[PDB]
Structure 1
Amino acid sequence: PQLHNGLDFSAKVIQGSLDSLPQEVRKFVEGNAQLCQPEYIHICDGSEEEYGRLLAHMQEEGVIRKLKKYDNCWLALTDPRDVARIESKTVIITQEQRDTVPIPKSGQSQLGRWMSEEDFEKAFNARFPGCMKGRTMYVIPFSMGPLGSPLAKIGIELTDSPYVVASMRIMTRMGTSVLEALGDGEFIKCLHSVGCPLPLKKPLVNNWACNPELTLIAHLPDRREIISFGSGYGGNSLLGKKCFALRIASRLAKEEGWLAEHMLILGITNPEGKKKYLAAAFPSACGKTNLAMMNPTLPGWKVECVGDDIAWMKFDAQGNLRAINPENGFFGVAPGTSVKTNPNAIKTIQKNTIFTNVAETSDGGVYWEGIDEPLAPGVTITSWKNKEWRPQDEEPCAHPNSRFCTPASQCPIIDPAWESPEGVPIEGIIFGGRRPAGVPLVYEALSWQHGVFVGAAMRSEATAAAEHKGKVIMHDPFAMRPFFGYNFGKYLAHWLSMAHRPAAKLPKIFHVNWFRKDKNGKFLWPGFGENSRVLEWMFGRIEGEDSAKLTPIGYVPKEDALNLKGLGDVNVEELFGISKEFWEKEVEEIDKYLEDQVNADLPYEIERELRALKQRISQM
Structure 2
Amino acid sequence: GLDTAPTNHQGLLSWVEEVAELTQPDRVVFTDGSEEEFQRLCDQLVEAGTFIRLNPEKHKNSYLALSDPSDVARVESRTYICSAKEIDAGPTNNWMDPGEMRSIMKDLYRGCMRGRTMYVVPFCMGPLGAEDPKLGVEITDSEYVVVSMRTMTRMGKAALEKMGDDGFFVKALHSVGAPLEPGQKDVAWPCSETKYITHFPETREIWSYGSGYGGNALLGKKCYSLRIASAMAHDEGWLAEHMLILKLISPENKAYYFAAAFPSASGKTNLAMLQPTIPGWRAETLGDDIAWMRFGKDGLYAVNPEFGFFGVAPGTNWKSNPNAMRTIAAGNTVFTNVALTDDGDVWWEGLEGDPQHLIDWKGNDWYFRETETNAAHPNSRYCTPMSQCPILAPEWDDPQGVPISGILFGGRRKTTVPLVTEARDWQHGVFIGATLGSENVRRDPMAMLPFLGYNVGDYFQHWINLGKHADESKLPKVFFVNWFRRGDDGRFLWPGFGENSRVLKWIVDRIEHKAGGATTPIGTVPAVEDLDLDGLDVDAADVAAALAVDADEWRQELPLIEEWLQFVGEKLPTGVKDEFDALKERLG
Q: TM-score, normalised by structure 1?
A: 0.91
Shift of 1:375: 4.4
Of the three residues 457, 480, 495, the one matched with 1:511 is 480
Give the match for residue 137 of structure 2: 156
Give the match for residue 269 of structure 2: 289
Distance 1:358 1:522, change over 3 A: farther
Q: Match for 1:387: what amino acid? A: N
Give the match for residue 368 of structure 2: 391
Instruction: For residue 337 of structure 1, give the secondary structure of its aligned residue in structure 2.
Output: coil
Give the match for residue 467 of structure 2: 499
Structure 2, unmatched stretches of 5+, are none
Give the match for residue 579 of structure 2: 609
Which whole-Å deviations, capped at 9, do the CAs of 1:236-267 have from their partners, x for residues lacking one? 11101211111111111111101100011111
Of the three residues 313, 317, 324, the one matched with 2:303 is 324
Of the three residues 313, 326, 329, the one matched with 1:334 is 313
Is 2:164 the partner of 1:185? no
Structure 1, unmatched stretches of 5+, are 1-8, 102-108, 462-471
Distance 1:587 1:489 in 2: 19
Distance 1:518 1:368 in 2: 32
Q: Match for 1:346: what amino acid? A: M
Give the match for residue 552 of structure 2: 581
Give the match for residue 558 of structure 1: 527
Distance 1:238 1:144, change over 3 A: same
Give the match for residue 538 of structure 1: 507
Shift of 1:151: 4.7
Of the three residues 590, 603, 608, the one matched with 2:561 is 590
Aligned pairs for 1:380-419 (under 5 A) are 380-392=357-369, 393-419=371-397
Is 2:67 the partner of 1:85? no
Shift of 1:422: 0.6
Give the match for residue 543 of structure 2: 572
Give the match for residue 63 of structure 1: 50
Of the three residues 429, 438, 446, the one matched with 1:460 is 438
Aligned partners of 2:22 and 2:111 also within 8 Å: yes
Distance 1:451 1:246 in 2: 21
Aligned pairs for 1:256-267 (under 5 A) are 256-267=236-247
Which whole-Å deviations, capped at 9, do the CAs of 1:57-82 have from their partners, x for residues lacking one? 10011001122121111111111121
Which whole-Å deviations, capped at 9, do the CAs of 1:171-192 have from their partners, x for residues lacking one? 0001112111101101100000
Instruction: For residue 340 of structure 2, give the secondary structure of its aligned residue in structure 1.
Output: strand
Distance 1:94 1:284, change over 3 A: same
Q: Match for 1:374: what amino acid? A: G
Give the match for residue 34 of structure 2: 47
Q: Match for 1:132: what amino acid? A: M
Distance 1:151 1:400, change over 3 A: farther
Distance 1:176 1:62 in 2: 28
Deviates more, 1:388-397 or 1:252-261: 388-397
Give the match for residue 123 of structure 2: 142
Distance 1:567 1:60 in 2: 54
Distance 1:181 1:118 in 2: 32
Shift of 1:457: 0.4
Instruction: For residue 314 of structure 2, give the secondary structure of its aligned residue in structure 1.
Output: coil
Aligned pairs for 1:301-380 (under 5 A) are 301-317=281-297, 319-350=298-329, 351-371=331-351, 373-375=352-354, 380=357
Aligned partners of 1:149 and 1:421 also within 8 Å: yes
Distance 1:91 1:306, change over 3 A: same
Distance 1:204 1:179, change over 3 A: closer
Which whole-Å deviations, capped at 9, do the CAs of 1:259-310 have from their partners, x for residues lacking one? 1000111111100111110000011222111111112222211111111111
Which whole-Å deviations, capped at 9, do the CAs of 1:490-548 have from their partners, x for residues lacking one? 11111111222243511110111112233444333222222111111111111112321
Aligned partners of 1:133 and 1:197 also within 8 Å: yes
Give the match for residue 204 of structure 2: 224
Instruction: For residue 485 of structure 1, give the secondary structure of its aligned residue in structure 2.
Output: coil
Distance 1:614 1:503, change over 3 A: closer
Give the match for residue 441 of structure 2: 473
Is 2:260 the partner of 1:280? yes
Give the match for residue 105 of structure 1: none
Give structure 1 regions of 4+ aligned residues with deviation exceeding 4 angstroms: 200-205
Distance 2:391 2:489 in 1: 36
Aligned partners of 1:93 and 1:221 also within 8 Å: yes
Deviates more, 1:558-567 or 1:138-147: 558-567
Q: Match for 2:68: what amino acid? A: D
Shift of 1:395: 2.3
Give the match for residue 174 of structure 1: 155
Aligned partners of 2:115 and 2:182 also within 8 Å: no
Give the match for residue 467 of structure 1: none
Distance 1:601 1:417, change over 3 A: same
Give the number of aligned pairs: 580
Distance 1:566 1:369, change over 3 A: farther
Distance 1:196 1:432 in 2: 41
Give the match for residue 96 of structure 1: 85
Aligned partners of 1:84 and 1:234 also within 8 Å: yes
Deviates more, 1:443-452 or 1:503-512: 503-512
Which whole-Å deviations, capped at 9, do the CAs of 1:162-216 have from their partners, x for residues lacking one? 00000000000011121111011011000000000003999987x21111x3100
Aligned partners of 2:506 and 2:515 also within 8 Å: no
Q: Match for 2:559: what amino acid? A: E
Aligned partners of 1:294 and 1:344 also within 8 Å: no
Aligned partners of 1:533 and 1:563 also within 8 Å: yes
Aligned partners of 2:437 and 2:444 also within 8 Å: yes
Q: Match for 2:485: what amino acid? A: R
Distance 1:19 1:375, change over 3 A: closer
Q: Match for 2:347: what amino acid? A: Y
Instruction: For residue 394 of structure 2, give the secondary structure of its aligned residue in structure 1.
Output: coil
Distance 1:21 1:230, change over 3 A: farther
Distance 2:583 2:49 in 1: 57
Shift of 1:374: 1.6
Distance 1:20 1:281 in 2: 39
Q: Match for 1:92: what amino acid? A: I
Distance 1:402 1:201 in 2: 33
CA RMSD of aligned residues (A): 1.8
Distance 1:204 1:448 in 2: 55
Distance 2:488 2:259 in 1: 32
Distance 1:438 1:201 in 2: 63
Distance 1:193 1:363 in 2: 35
Give the match for residue 398 of structure 2: 420
